[PDB]
Amino acid sequence: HHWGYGKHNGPEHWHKDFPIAKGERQSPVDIDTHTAKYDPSLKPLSVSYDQATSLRILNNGHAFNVEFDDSQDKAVLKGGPLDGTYRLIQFHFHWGSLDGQGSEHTVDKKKYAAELHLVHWNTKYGDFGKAVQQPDGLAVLGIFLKVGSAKPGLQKVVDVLDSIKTKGKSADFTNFDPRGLLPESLDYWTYPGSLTTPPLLECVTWIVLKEPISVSSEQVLKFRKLNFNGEGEPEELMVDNWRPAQPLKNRQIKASFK
Ligand SMILES: NS(=O)(=O)c1ccc(C(=O)N2CCN(c3cc4c(cc3F)c(=O)c(C(=O)O)cn4C3CC3)CC2)cc1
Ligand SMILES: [Zn+2]
Secondary structure, three states: OOOOOOOOOOHHHHHHHOHHHHOOOOOOOEEOOOOOEEOOOOOOEEEEOOOOOEEEEEEOOOOEEEEEOOOOOOOEEEEOOOOOOEEEEEEEEEEOOOOOOOOOOEEOOEOOOEEEEEEEEEHHHOOHHHHOOOOOOEEEEEEEEEEOOOOHHHHHHHHHHHHHOOOOOEEEOOOOOHHHHOOOOOOEEEEEEOOOOOOOOOOEEEEEEOOOEEEOHHHHHHHOOOEOOOOOOOOOEOOOOOOOOOOOOOOOOEEOOO
């Protein structure tokens, strides 16, 4: 009886195995745009992905991860609210069964069709497993997806999903450039939070871009043909793999922009 996103094992159940689910800095949250304060002290955000080395794509039973070589400082996130250097390790998405839901963060209670998470870890902790034990261990760059025009830079991901339909399947996924997944603007909101899946560790600086990217109905339909289940098991479509907004508690969401 493992965690997941079903009636019997979904977000409302997680606290039983992972009591930090009811903690002081859980993610995601609703971003109240009228309450978030511009912070003139926020340094410029630096997304350096020119030397990114993608390796593999994995269906982990919850989402799919595009994994990167993080054995040296190739693709890094710096600046913004961050101190030091954060190495890209993987990206994944959360998405809905329909276009009116799927994002984890919400904007004035608005749900997007999906949300991309580019996950990075603080190199002062030496490895990802040590970083997740620290309050400043991870930086996740979150990008909203809306349904409209196709995102050309997403199509190589959409076209490999057939090959990783079920839990535990992977495929070679070299030479993928994550710069093709960014919006024009790097305006963002930031707040201290957590992993949005078990074990829900409170180790994440969240950086959520204001500008969504557009993907096509056909692109997000291919996400929804994935499976939570393993090969040969009854089909359970991989949809609605999102955690709802959590209480903000004693936190301020800061804006990079006026
Ligand atoms: N939606 S999201 O919020 O962006 C997001 C959600 C999940 C993930 C993710 O990929 N995971 C979550 C962390 N999880 C963990 C890994 C851990 C440890 C603890 C861990 F929770 C340890 O304490 C530990 C130790 O040294 O003792 C070692 N490891 C590593 C070596 C395997 C690895 C998988 C990323 C982003
Ligand atoms: Zn995520």
